[PDB]
Amino acid sequence: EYGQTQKMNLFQSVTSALDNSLAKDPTAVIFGEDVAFGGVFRCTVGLRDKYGKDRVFNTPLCEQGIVGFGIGIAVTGATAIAEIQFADYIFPAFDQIVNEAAKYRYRSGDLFNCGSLTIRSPWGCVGHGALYHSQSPEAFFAHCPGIKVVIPRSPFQAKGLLLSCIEDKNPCIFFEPKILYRAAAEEVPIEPYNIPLSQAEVIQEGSDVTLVAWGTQVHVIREVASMAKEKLGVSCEVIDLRTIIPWDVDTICKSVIKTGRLLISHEAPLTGGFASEISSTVQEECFLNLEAPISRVCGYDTPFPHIFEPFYIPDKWKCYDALRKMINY
Amino acid sequence: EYGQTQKMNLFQSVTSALDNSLAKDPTAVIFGEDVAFGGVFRCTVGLRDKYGKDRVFNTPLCEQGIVGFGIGIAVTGATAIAEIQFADYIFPAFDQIVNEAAKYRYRSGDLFNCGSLTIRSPWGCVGHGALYHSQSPEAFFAHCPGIKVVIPRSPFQAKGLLLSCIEDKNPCIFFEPKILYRAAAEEVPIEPYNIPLSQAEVIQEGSDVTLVAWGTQVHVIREVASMAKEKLGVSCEVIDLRTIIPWDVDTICKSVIKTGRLLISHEAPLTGGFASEISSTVQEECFLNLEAPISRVCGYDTPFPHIFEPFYIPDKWKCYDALRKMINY
Amino acid sequence: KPQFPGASAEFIDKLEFIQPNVISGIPIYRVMDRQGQIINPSEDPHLPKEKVLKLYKSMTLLNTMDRILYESQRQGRISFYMTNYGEEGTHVGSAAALDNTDLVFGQYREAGVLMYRDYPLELFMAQCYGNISDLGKGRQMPVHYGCKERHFVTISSPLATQIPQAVGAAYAAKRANANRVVICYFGEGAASEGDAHAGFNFAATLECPIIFFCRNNGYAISTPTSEQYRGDGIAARGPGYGIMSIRVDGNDVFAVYNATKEARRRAVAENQPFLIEAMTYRIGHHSTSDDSSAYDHPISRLRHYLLSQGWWDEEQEKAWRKQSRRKVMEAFEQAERKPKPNPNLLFSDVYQEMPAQLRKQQESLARHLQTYGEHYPLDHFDK
Amino acid sequence: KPQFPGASAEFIDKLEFIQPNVISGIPIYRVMDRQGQIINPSEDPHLPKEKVLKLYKSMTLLNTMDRILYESQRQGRISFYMTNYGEEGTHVGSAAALDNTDLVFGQYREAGVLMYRDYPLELFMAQCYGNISDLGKGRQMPVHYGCKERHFVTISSPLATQIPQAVGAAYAAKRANANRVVICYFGEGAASEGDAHAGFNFAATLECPIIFFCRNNGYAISTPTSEQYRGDGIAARGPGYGIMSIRVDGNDVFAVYNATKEARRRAVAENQPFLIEAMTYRIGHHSTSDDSSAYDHPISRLRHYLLSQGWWDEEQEKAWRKQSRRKVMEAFEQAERKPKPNPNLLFSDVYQEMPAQLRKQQESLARHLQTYGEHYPLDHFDK
Numbered sequence A, B: 001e002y003g004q005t006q007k008m009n010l011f012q013s014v015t016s017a018l019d020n021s022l023a024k025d026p027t028a029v030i031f032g033e034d035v036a037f038g039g040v041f042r043c044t045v046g047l048r049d050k051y052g053k054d055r056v057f058n059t060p061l062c063e064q065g066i067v068g069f070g071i072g073i074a075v076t077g078a079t080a081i082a083e084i085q086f087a088d089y090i091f092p093a094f095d096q097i098v099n100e101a102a103k104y105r106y107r108s109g110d111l112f113n114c115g116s117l118t119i120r121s122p123w124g125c126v127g128h129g130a131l132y133h134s135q136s137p138e139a140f141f142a143h144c145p146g147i148k149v150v151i152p153r154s155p156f157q158a159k160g161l162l163l164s165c166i167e168d169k170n171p172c173i174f175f176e177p178k179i180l181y182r183a184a185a186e187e188v189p190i191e192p193y194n195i196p197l198s199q200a201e202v203i204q205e206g207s208d209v210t211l212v213a214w215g216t217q218v219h220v221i222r223e224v225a226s227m228a229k230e231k232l233g234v235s236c237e238v239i240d241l242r243t244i245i246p247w248d249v250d251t252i253c254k255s256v257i258k259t260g261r262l263l264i265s266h267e268a269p270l271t272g273g274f275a276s277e278i279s280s281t282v283q284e285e286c287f288l289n290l291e292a293p294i295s296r297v298c299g300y301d302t303p304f305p306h307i308f309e310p311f312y313i314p315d316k317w318k319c320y321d322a323l324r325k326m327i328n329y
Numbered sequence C, D: 001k002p003q004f005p006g007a008s009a010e011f012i013d014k015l016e017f018i019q020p021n022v023i024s025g026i027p028i029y030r031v032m033d034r035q036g037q038i039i040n041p042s043e044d045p046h047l048p049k050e051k052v053l054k055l056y057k058s059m060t061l062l063n064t065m066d067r068i069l070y071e072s073q074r075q076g077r078i079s080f081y082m083t084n085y086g087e088e089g090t091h092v093g094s095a096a097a098l099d100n101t102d103l104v105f106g107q108y109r110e111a112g113v114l115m116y117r118d119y120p121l122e123l124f125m126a127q128c129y130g131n132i133s134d135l136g137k138g139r140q141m142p143v144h145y146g147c148k149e150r151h152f153v154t155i156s157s158p159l160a161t162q163i164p165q166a167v168g169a170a171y172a173a174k175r176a177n178a179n180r181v182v183i184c185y186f187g188e189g190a191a192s193e194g195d196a197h198a199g200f201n202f203a204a205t206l207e208c209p210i211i212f213f214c215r216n217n218g219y220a221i222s223t224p225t226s227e228q229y230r231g232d233g234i235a236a237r238g239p240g241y242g243i244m245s246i247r248v249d250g251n252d253v254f255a256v257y258n259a260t261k262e263a264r265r266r267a268v269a270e271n272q273p274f275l276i277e278a279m280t281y282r283i284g285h286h287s288t289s290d291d292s293s294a295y296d297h298p299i300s301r302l303r304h305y306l307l308s309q310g311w312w313d314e315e316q317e318k319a320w321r322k323q324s325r326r327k328v329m330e331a332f333e334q335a336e337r338k339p340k341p342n343p344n345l346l347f348s349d350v351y352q353e354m355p356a357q358l359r360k361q362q363e364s365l366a367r368h369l370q371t372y373g374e375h376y377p378l379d380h381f382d383k
């Protein structure tokens, strides 16, 4: 339906989305630390040679500067695609994102805006990243009205979601699961296409329990659904949330109304994690339908450890066990 | 209970807590923007005169610097009491708080720590503060393991909780409800005393519904409890959470187990607000006891407006109406 | 010869630390003395009578408005206010040197820039009252002005955040071949923020047509400059970032005009940033929330210049004082009588398009007001 | 004469913008040439033989360790590594000028400071392997070393965050009347962060006994300095903050030593910050995750000097190379064979105490491992 496709891994699908964007939008620019030579994860390879040094360029090493600068470009109406090297380093720009970007349109009565800003950043665990190359900071941003937060689960999803973010008329933060950058490839349209924001995706229909996740964790819950079918004869509905904020409350509630059970999982720490917002909302909307307490299987309330990573992550065994207990409730 | 008392409003109780701290701990220093002359909310009046310019002093106008500086002092084992002018301007220091302060002990294997740091900041609505002199940022910090977040409801509570923060062996953020600074005074002990952290207070016993709030909102839910008894013949258990993280899960669950209904209220926006964490947790622990969906009466998912403040806040009427519907459920 | 990539220099065979020159800092550029006399004819901009009268009348109309709104705040008619006393010359002198389409980013104490650009008194008042005519829709605190039509980016409270933003806007302008400059105003206190460092560096490395204008008025609320920095003010920071810098007498509209005019010409032509530190004094309270007693005027100087040219007199002064007062009061009285905007406006513009969950909250309020409306000031708000 | 509180200066009657001189920047202090010859006899610190040999042996031992660890990362034995090639002289030269109790804050490319301070090879290896002997309890990535006993604050990944922290530590030291200095290392790339601006300013206004030591090695990953800044490197920024500054040949242990010795002496006596920018070149890759090709030496220089004093020869060079390789290989192989720490250490030190809800999560993991343990590397971790 999308024209000719090519097998692409995540980093390739991101370059493809970026290339498509600069091609059709002459105002678009890409900037950040080390993006000129192609980026530390190869997501910008060939772009500077194709579009020019004034359109794909390095900034000084300063995240608050990168986002403030991007907001300023967007204030003029030009498309600004900023890169934050690792999501773990987005915090120096927290004030520019939360106090500035998110409130720009509102506070000016729509006289000014930075809707044409997109911030993209590597995200999630990577096996050995430890405290500062593994973070999943979406819940910190989920409490800020005015920005959209989007996380893909695959190359096809990434290109379509990123193009939607770039084109959206609101500041967007796009988190790319770095462990997937050079993982398996999948068919990705060479030409631009969009995947809607604020729309979750039911990737597998089920009747006994609803499983919700995003990023790499969607693959974990897909495996959990397989394990539950084989070991317990339980039918799981697997859902990819995709957009953290504004989230697709309707798709999730409709599923839980049918199944009566819900398990949400995320690599980020449990306390104040985004699963708490989904759980609270579902309990409020589907009280009559819930047969068991809602389960949250997340990373522990610690910093992200180096040597202990295998014990920290909410893996398939942890999720499966929680699901078994919830089903037997 | 605590010896000689004195009528003090909230700003005065903070000064008393600070005075007590510098008197008993010679390493303690207080610093931030405009603290030398007494502070923009008078919280440090007379301290520089009493303890010296080397102990109560102004910093450059730079929040990231204030927190980084305070962490360095604490690294040497000296008590560092940093002030952030308005909670709304704590964001430039988000990286120093989240990536540094919270993770300092963990990441060093306890070779180093910044346990002796306390960050105090004016918080909450003030009638006309608009977007940047009204924020309630606690939920942003609740997703960060390694820090404590504490909010008092009165002068007596403020002095006891602040002293516990200053003395606690972990970095703490103490949010002072600014609307209360000059509100009613109450008797406060002049000598030091402590109120424990991670302990909620059941201020009014009840049997039909549990109400939870913190800061000024506690006064709103006390009024709602009165309205509910009067107009509906409903017995409300009123709880002041006090510590956002680590929070008193036990006290809250115990109350809900007895009442079977919970309403949580906070000035902060709904989505990603701390009520979601409480609601999710309570539903997890009290599923067999919950007779109705848990209600969350919060600020709307918008920036904090100037002229529209009276319509934005989760006032007694909004809380009462939600409670009424929850009781009728 | 040294071969290091990071710097271009020669070797030195003796250990010598570089001392800052703070006691004898960068000199203060001044065109006219305190008696309004041109000190060096070669520096006279020879601005036409109509232009100089506009500079004078903009400064005085702003002072008149400040007095009235400051009093309005003391009476509790507006929730907050910040005056511009002693700084009117830096605003009008710099605004006059720009093209009217040059984009302005400010802090909150640059209202004279808008006054010079003919922002209606009605709109200054509407923002302070948060009434229905406010293009900001009553969402921000008073003095948080913005004007798309007059290229003045809406003010925001967080200090220095506009600095790297102005740089981004200047980069975009450069790309667009607009032949436009961006000016970014901030105080000496705000200059201590990390965002100032970000902005200054980015402008130089990315070669942006921007003028950084620092108002150094001696205090950041209660904090004197001696507790703000130890180097030679803000101007001395410019060269270290590779930025052409200058210090001017902020109480001299002509010195301010001259420095801004030259900076603009070169910034646009060379795509290079310029830094102007204007020295003044904060004559009024920091704000209505401050009592400054707890811790050479631009208007009089220009007035003496005007008299010297035969361009003003005591009679014209009296008549203008009267007319300006009537104009401000007319706008003030109109502003007070207008209702506030519809409470529904609390929910729009959060996102361009209203998310369904946000509309649900809007509907929640509507239902709430239908049942509990008597407890709200509905009569003072639109519809 | 100007009356403005913000600056100390005279008036100037001509418009003149202050230009930075980047072409002829701050000169680079050098003590010995590329052949190890003392250029100016009065600058020779005449350090004793034992001390100079310690400088040389520390540099070479660090180089031997780097070679082995870098190769082990390529062999998939450790997950990550960052070499110190070409910067060994900045580490040892500065470390030798400090008192052993002076507190050090660093970035990640200052391991030679720990080496000079005799940090055990076993502990460098324990951290890289995240084994049971790691004082950091295997929680951070490799090269994130820390040593309370040797006064070396645990390294953290976020760049420049240690800068204002080091300033706070210096302020506390001043108060404690310690007679100690704090040194804080960072790269030219990290100097672009807002925290650098915060630290430099706070140190000057608060009068702190601190030495800011910038390693300017020409690149921040793939970014050349031409895209990092446009002023005369980092040293030129110092004076603007009122900080005594100097630039030195980073490939000269004696220039680094001399500058650091004098800065310490003065910082401690005067309670004022000092900035030293050491010019070098990043010889190796940025890290094991970077392949440099996509975008004189301190050791040989000192070796030349040693030969002129008759303090080293080829036999001693061969012997030391052999002995250092043996010591490094023994520590490396021992470290690789050690178990990792108990998985329960994943939960401690988050807070000083363990919150009951955190204890609950530890209990959950224990129960999980009782049932699904076969799916985890339990036999490699302490029990």
Ligand SMILES: Cc1ncc(C[n+]2c([C-](O)C(C)C)sc(CCOP(=O)(O)OP(=O)(O)O)c2C)c(N)n1
Pocket (backbone or CB within 6 Å): B033, B061, B063, B085, B089, B092, C108, C109, C156, C157, C158, C159, C186, C187, C188, C189, C190, C191, C215, C217, C219, C220, C221, C282, C286, C287
């Ligand atoms: C990041 C941050 N930190 C603190 C403040 C508080 N504040 C202010 C407000 O909140 C205003 C807008 C009402 S104004 C102000 C002093 C700024 O001093 P300055 O020298 O930059 O400017 P002025 O002398 O012209 O007031 C502070 C510290 C702030 N606005 N932003």
Ligand SMILES: Cc1ncc(C[n+]2c([C-](O)C(C)C)sc(CCOP(=O)(O)OP(=O)(O)O)c2C)c(N)n1
Pocket (backbone or CB within 6 Å): A033, A061, A063, A085, A089, A092, D108, D109, D156, D157, D158, D159, D186, D187, D188, D189, D190, D191, D215, D217, D219, D220, D221, D282, D286, D287
């Ligand atoms: C705030 C922030 N932003 C980006 C980075 C990424 N990063 C690095 C890592 O993540 C390491 C610790 C593995 S190292 C690095 C370049 C630093 O350049 P520099 O000149 O300061 O230092 P070197 O030339 O000695 O590496 C960046 C941008 C980072 N660590 N922190």
Ligand SMILES: [K+]
Pocket (backbone or CB within 6 Å): A115, A116, A117, A118, A165, A166, A167, A168, A169, A170, A171, A172
């Ligand atoms: K966008």
Ligand SMILES: [K+]
Pocket (backbone or CB within 6 Å): B115, B116, B117, B118, B165, B166, B167, B168, B169, B170, B171, B172
């Ligand atoms: K503490």
Ligand SMILES: [K+]
Pocket (backbone or CB within 6 Å): C106, C107, C155, C156, C157, C158, C159, C160, C161, C162
């Ligand atoms: K601003």
Ligand SMILES: [K+]
Pocket (backbone or CB within 6 Å): D106, D107, D155, D156, D157, D158, D159, D160, D161, D162
């Ligand atoms: K660091």
Ligand SMILES: [Mn+2]
Pocket (backbone or CB within 6 Å): C187, C188, C189, C215, C216, C217, C218, C219, C220, C221, C282
């Ligand atoms: Mn000022």
Ligand SMILES: [Mn+2]
Pocket (backbone or CB within 6 Å): D187, D188, D189, D215, D216, D217, D218, D219, D220, D221
């Ligand atoms: Mn470097």
